[PDB]
RNA sequence: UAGGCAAAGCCGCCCGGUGGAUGGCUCGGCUCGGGCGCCGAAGAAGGGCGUGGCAAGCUGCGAUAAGCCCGGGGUAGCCGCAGGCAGGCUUAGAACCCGGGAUCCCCGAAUGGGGCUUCCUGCCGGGGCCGAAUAGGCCCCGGCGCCCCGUAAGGGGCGGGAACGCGGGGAAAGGAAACAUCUUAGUACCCGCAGGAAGGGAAGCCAACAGGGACCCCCUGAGUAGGGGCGACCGAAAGGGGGAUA
RNA sequence: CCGUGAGGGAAAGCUGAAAAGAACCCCGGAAGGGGGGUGAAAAGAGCCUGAAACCGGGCGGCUACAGUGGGGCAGGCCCGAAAGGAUGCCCCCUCCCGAAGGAAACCCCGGUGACGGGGGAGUACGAGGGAGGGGGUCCAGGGUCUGCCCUUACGUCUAGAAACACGGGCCGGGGAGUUCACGGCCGUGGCGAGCCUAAGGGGUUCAACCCCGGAGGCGUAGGGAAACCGACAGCCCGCAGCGGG
RNA sequence: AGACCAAUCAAGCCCGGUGAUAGCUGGUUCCCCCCGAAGCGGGUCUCAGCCCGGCCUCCCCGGAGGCGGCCGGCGGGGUAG
RNA sequence: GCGGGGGCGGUGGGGUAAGCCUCCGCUCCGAGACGGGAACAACCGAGACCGGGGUUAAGGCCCCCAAGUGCGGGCUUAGUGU
RNA sequence: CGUGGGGUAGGGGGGCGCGGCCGUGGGGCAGAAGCCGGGCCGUGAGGUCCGGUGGACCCGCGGCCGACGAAGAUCCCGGCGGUAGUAGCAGCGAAGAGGGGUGAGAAGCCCCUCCGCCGGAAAGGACCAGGGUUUCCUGGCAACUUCAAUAGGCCAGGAGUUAG
RNA sequence: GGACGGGGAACGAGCCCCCGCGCCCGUACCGAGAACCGACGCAGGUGCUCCUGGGUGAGAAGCCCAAGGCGGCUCGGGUGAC
RNA sequence: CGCAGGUCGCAGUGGCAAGGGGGACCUGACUGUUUAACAAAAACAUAGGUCCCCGCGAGCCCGUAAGGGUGUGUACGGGGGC
RNA sequence: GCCCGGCGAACCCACCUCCAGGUGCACAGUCCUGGGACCCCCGACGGGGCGAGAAGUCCCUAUGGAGCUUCACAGCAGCCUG
RNA sequence: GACGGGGUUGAUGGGGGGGCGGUGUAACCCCCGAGGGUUUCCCGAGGGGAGAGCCGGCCCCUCCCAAUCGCCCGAGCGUGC
């Protein structure tokens, strides 16, 4: 099957202009998709929200640190009964270390970087402008319980879409922006 | 003071993911009308197993196994559902359709005898094989059920079929605003027995002094007579009109 | 497929006209992704359309000193192309008419007084209905938020439901006064001291339709258990109507 | 021990009679307009039901009187005191 | 429909009494919006087609809250009371 | 004309919608039904039009007929939520570690070394019923194993049971 | 298997040597804290049904160790609050 | 299996393994059985005692019937109560 | 248990609720009058939500059952008798 | 989560040395040993002497190792009363 993106190329260009103030063409846009990943969908949503707005190299470095358990991912929405931790950012104490999600996102970012290179864009000036994760289909299963009943035990897959744009280096950020209250 | 100015969160629209509603479709169902109507010891229906070059299921077929022969129709394509890969068949007339034949494993009324495993096993006759042998042994084929009719030869019954038919055995729930007679109902259901229909059928009739004229089925007589805790409720027949006519 | 068994028993339709079923390039361990193609259209084999619930992102409004949903009025921000008006809307001014209602200063009479009365004055004004002048751009409508005013989820039994009475997590689809016989009645239609045919028969363009079929049913007369018997235009009151004054 | 007879026993299970019956409980789907109740009396194995009247609604016939009020004439009554 | 209920009156009759049982009459709720009563079916006012203007009813007029820190006389010292 | 305008149960009167039939008049590949948002009309049931999507049927009017209108039945079927990235993946007296190899990827697969558990046995030998290919070999990881996997009673292909 | 009897032939063995035949069906694997039943790769049930070396020991007890097998009663790490 | 001597510890069946004991009442003699899944008991059974129907073509019981059980039995017996 | 990595449900759910004193189908999150609260997140508990589970088995009603009893109303086998 | 201290102008954790402390006297060596035998140079439970030995989630001293390299947040401007 074919999975569409939530944002077309012209809307991506409009968002790029509205967020940075430069005008770019569809040829400066690179997309990647990872359909039906077997991982946590809530943590996938959190990771996509965090990595939106970084450059590709910044996102890759942070995801590698996440996989090495050296930098956490902030949990803003799916935070019920989740512990507090010391964080490298400011404004939010709920952090996790999603390793499986981080590896799948690293594979997706590798595909996106290859697509940008094939289109001929400079990878050092590629900024992530759109990132989304959706609940895909379910691989169902049953867990037997006491007293002869059986309850659902499902693997809810994830579809991840990412779109990045090649921007002028005078507008591309040079460091992480880690004030999540303002972010 | 307020804006730049934002957490988590809330509302509305748009796009995406999920989902499979809606709409359109239909080689399916349902109802009604008409026809046609038995199969089985010449071994049936039903079941098991098998059967395709790649084939699991369905369909078909039966070790000759999606098949064999003959005739008629049908001409150029064909090898089912089923749109793949090969290799073939066919103009010496295939496929396909119709009629007639051949084959038709095991179990099955199953019928030589068993059957706690759809498989096993006996006696007799003939045949084959191992074997030095004509011994002994093993294998193949045929016959061997019960009850009957018939002098014998020979023949009959058995099982199945969606519903309908005939004979017998035969409830309760419910209703009666309780409940027993009653009803439900001669029903449900059970046992037995037939046919393409069955059963019925040719006046020891009906009538009323006038006359009909075997039988079945339809319309009516009629919810009338009558039966009945005369309650619920049940319930004709003669006669008349038709189908048909023996 | 379930049960030892007698028995019981689902879910599940749709590519395209044609596979033209997606060549080729980059990445990926692979599912697969990007680019590039076929096709009128991806309609992509997870295959017509593709709703809502639900989840993600963007946008608009709010967002940490203020207690929530619904309604009315006023406002802030945002949309307002079409289908609505723009001959609109709003402001100001002026003019005219104007229902019920209806002042004030001031003068006069009274009361300790709050106040009453005569005049001012049925006056100024007053819902609304007409006309014109200038100024401006949208107005209606929609989303969200704020202020003020109003406001005790739904369905149900009940005298009494917001109830500490019971039912529903949400959304989609499904889901309940039917038909026959008989009887009573009503609204109409046909015929009328008569009305209708039933079964069935003939024809047909063949279950329609045309014709036949009066058997029988109900009405035309009642009383009585039954035997048995078996019926009106005479008088008065008087609505309508007609005639007379 | 009314134990057990296939997770079933003060009388198994399967299919059928069977859509058993239920005065009882739950549900019963679109809009506007006109009128608009009752929980009273009597009977009932009647008291959570039903029938006959009172109360509602609609249609028709009928034909001029009717009465939740008051004054007066002529009457009834046996309560408060 | 044949379960009624509230207020007031019959010292109704009963009962210690009861938001208690059982009769009689008007009205209201049930089946009736709305104003007042701090909320509140039946207490007071009052009966609602829709929109607007005005005036009143119950009740209120220091603030909450529209309308009076209104007027004359007298009493209360208990925040009694409102 | 009305000192007309509340109303449950219930009675009476009219209308909207859905599927089809008898007529009649039309629309449609220059885009039908359906779906999403919006404007206008109507007290209302509802109607109609605009923009997007979609891809072949549909509609106005008169008459007639119904398997004809849902918010609810601890309703039926299906899908999907919050709960929540939460409970559980402890208890029944065993458990792992180092190095190497394979591999995209290794705490967990293969080999060695160390450590441990059973040893008249939840554990070593045999084997009945029942199961029926789970046995063996090769390859693999879409699904299965309460985590992983390159492992496997799993998936695919092939093979295997010899009697006086 | 033996014995006790009847009948028959001229041959002839339970001893030695040599020759021939023995059909049909089962036969893999688990046999259970994952191959059976219990909806499950289920702490239950079926089957511990039958068998098992050394030390200590009354002991087929317990504890330790052979033969033999296992780390698959199929989550891992950190922390050392209640 | 025993005797003599020496000697250590808090502890010598040093771990493992491994009875607390006694008096009195009620009650059922005892061993045994019981409500699979809330009752293990004083409940049931029991040996012992006693009564009744029965001489067999019996008594008692089952079957529609054909017939059957007690009975391949016989009063030191079969059946039925307490 | 808590924290990290991996897998990943269920119950329950009209919407969802700070406290006091009232009112009301008489035991209010939603009504009245007050008192308070910056918002969000973690852990724990079990006072409240007349918390959840189960159309209350307790009581009554129904002209509803089932089983058992007999001196109920009837009936049928069985046995005895003519 | 937080909080507190140190972070090379440093004694923050470890190593080493010292102090203090727990247990109880290791190894080696020498003496005795009930009694037996290879007669008395052997065995032998065990006692004695010197030596303690082991250990410290405490204190001091000492830069021997590591407190590094790095990653971020952050006011700045207008408006009206
Ligand atoms: Mg179970
Ligand atoms: Mg998952
Ligand atoms: Mg926010
Ligand atoms: Mg056959
Ligand atoms: Mg046979
Ligand atoms: Mg026959
Ligand atoms: Mg019936
Ligand atoms: Mg009855
Ligand atoms: Mg009865
Ligand atoms: Mg005949
Ligand atoms: Mg005949
Ligand atoms: Mg009859
Ligand atoms: Mg589709
Ligand atoms: Mg416009
Ligand atoms: Mg216009
Ligand atoms: Mg109630
Ligand atoms: Mg009540
Ligand atoms: Mg009522
Ligand atoms: Mg209510
Ligand atoms: Mg109830
Ligand atoms: Mg509920
Ligand atoms: Mg008892
Ligand atoms: Mg029974
Ligand atoms: Mg039944
Ligand atoms: Mg009225
Ligand atoms: Mg009731
Ligand atoms: Mg009078
Ligand atoms: Mg008196
Ligand atoms: Mg009453
Ligand atoms: Mg009253
Ligand atoms: Mg009030
Ligand atoms: Mg005021
Ligand atoms: Mg009205
Ligand atoms: Mg029409
Ligand atoms: Mg309803
Ligand atoms: Mg459901
Ligand atoms: Mg969920
Ligand atoms: Mg976790
Ligand atoms: Mg846990
Ligand atoms: Mg052990
Ligand atoms: Mg051991
Ligand atoms: Mg074993
Ligand atoms: Mg294997
Ligand atoms: Mg293998
Ligand atoms: Mg397999
Ligand atoms: Mg074997
Ligand atoms: Mg297991
Ligand atoms: Mg042992
Ligand atoms: Mg070993
Ligand atoms: Mg393990
Ligand atoms: Mg753990
Ligand atoms: Mg012990
Ligand atoms: Mg005892
Ligand atoms: Mg005992
Ligand atoms: Mg028990
Ligand atoms: Mg017990
Ligand atoms: Mg006893
Ligand atoms: Mg005695
Ligand atoms: Mg006695
Ligand atoms: Mg009260
Ligand atoms: Mg509440
Ligand atoms: Mg109940
Ligand atoms: Mg109950
Ligand atoms: Mg009771
Ligand atoms: Mg009654
Ligand atoms: Mg019974």
Q: Establish whether the CB of A136 is closer than 7 Å to any nucleic acid atom in strand B.
A: yes
Give the position of tokens 């990771």: A47
Q: From CA A75, how far away is CA A180, in angstroms rounded?
A: 11
Q: From CA A54, how far away is CA A63, in angstroms rounded?
A: 12
Q: From CA A47, how far away is CA A80, in angstroms rounded?
A: 17
Q: From CA A49, how far away is CA A173, in angstroms rounded?
A: 17
Q: For A51, phi and psi rounded to 5 degrees?
A: -80, -10
Q: From CA A139, how far away is CA A142, in angstroms rounded?
A: 10
Sequence-separated (6 or more) residues with CB below 8 Å from residue A21: A171
Q: For A53, phi and psi rounded to 5 degrees?
A: 100, -15
Tell me how far the alpha carbon of residue A147 is from its chain's centroid: 42
Smallest CA-to-CA distance from A103 within A150, A80, A69, A58 is with A69
Q: From CA A51, how far away is CA A102, in angstroms rounded?
A: 11
Three-state SS string over chain A comes to CCCCCCCCHHHHHHHHHHHHCCCCCHHHEEEEEEEEECCCHHHHHHHHHHHCCCEHHHHHHHHHHHHCCCCCEECCCCCCCCCECCCCCECCCEEECCHHHHHHHHHHHHHHHHHHHHHCCCHHHEEEEEEEEEEEEEECCEEECHHHCEEECCEEEEEEEEEEEECCCCCCCCCCCCECCCC
A3 Cα: distance to centroid of ligand 6 (angstroms): 69
**Cβ A148 vs Cβ A59: under 8 Å:** no
| Separation between the CA of A161 and the C1’ of B91 (whole angstroms) | 64
Q: From CA A55, how far away is CA A172, in angstroms rounded?
A: 8
| Separation between the CA of A61 and the C1’ of F112 (whole angstroms) | 39
| Separation between the CA of A7 and the C1’ of C34 (whole angstroms) | 16
Q: Establish whether the CB of A18 is closer than 7 Å to any nucleic acid atom in strand B.
A: no
CB neighbours of residue A142 within 10 Å = 11
Bases of chain I with protein Cβ within 7 A: 2-10, 41-43
Tokens found for residue A6: 């939530």
**Cβ A43 vs Cβ A96: under 8 Å:** yes
Q: From CA A87, how far away is CA A176, in angstroms rounded?
A: 14
Q: Establish whether the CB of A179 is closer than 7 Å to any nucleic acid atom in strand J.
A: yes
| Separation between the CA of A140 and the C1’ of F163 (whole angstroms) | 52
CB neighbours of residue A95 within 10 Å = 19
Q: How was this structure determined?
A: cryo-EM
Bases of chain F with protein Cβ within 7 A: 80-81, 83-87, 143-146
């Amino acid at each position: 099957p074919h999975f569409h993106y939530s944002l077309t190329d012209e809307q991506a260009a409009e968002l790029v202009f509205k967020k940075y103030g430069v005008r770019i063409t569809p040829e400066q846009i690179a997309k990647a998709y990872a359909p039906e990943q077997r991982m946590s969908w809530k943590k996938s949503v959190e990771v996509a929200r965090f990595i939106k707005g970084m450059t590709l190299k910044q996102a890759k470095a942070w995801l590698e640190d996440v996989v090495k358990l050296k930098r956490p991912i902030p949990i803003k929405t799916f935070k019920k009964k989740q512990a507090h931790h010391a964080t490298p950012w400011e404004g939010w104490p709920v952090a996790k270390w999603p390793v499986k999600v981080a590896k799948r996102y690293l594979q997706l970012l590798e595909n996106l970087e290859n697509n940008a290179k094939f289109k001929g864009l400079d990878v050092e000036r590629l900024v992530i402008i759109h990132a989304a994760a959706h609940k895909g289909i379910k691989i169902p299963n049953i867990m037997p319980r006491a007293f002869g009943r059986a309850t659902p035990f499902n693997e809810e897959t994830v579809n991840v879409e990412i779109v990045a744009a090649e921007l002028p280096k005078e507008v591309v950020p040079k460091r992480y922006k880690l004030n999540l209250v303002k972010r």
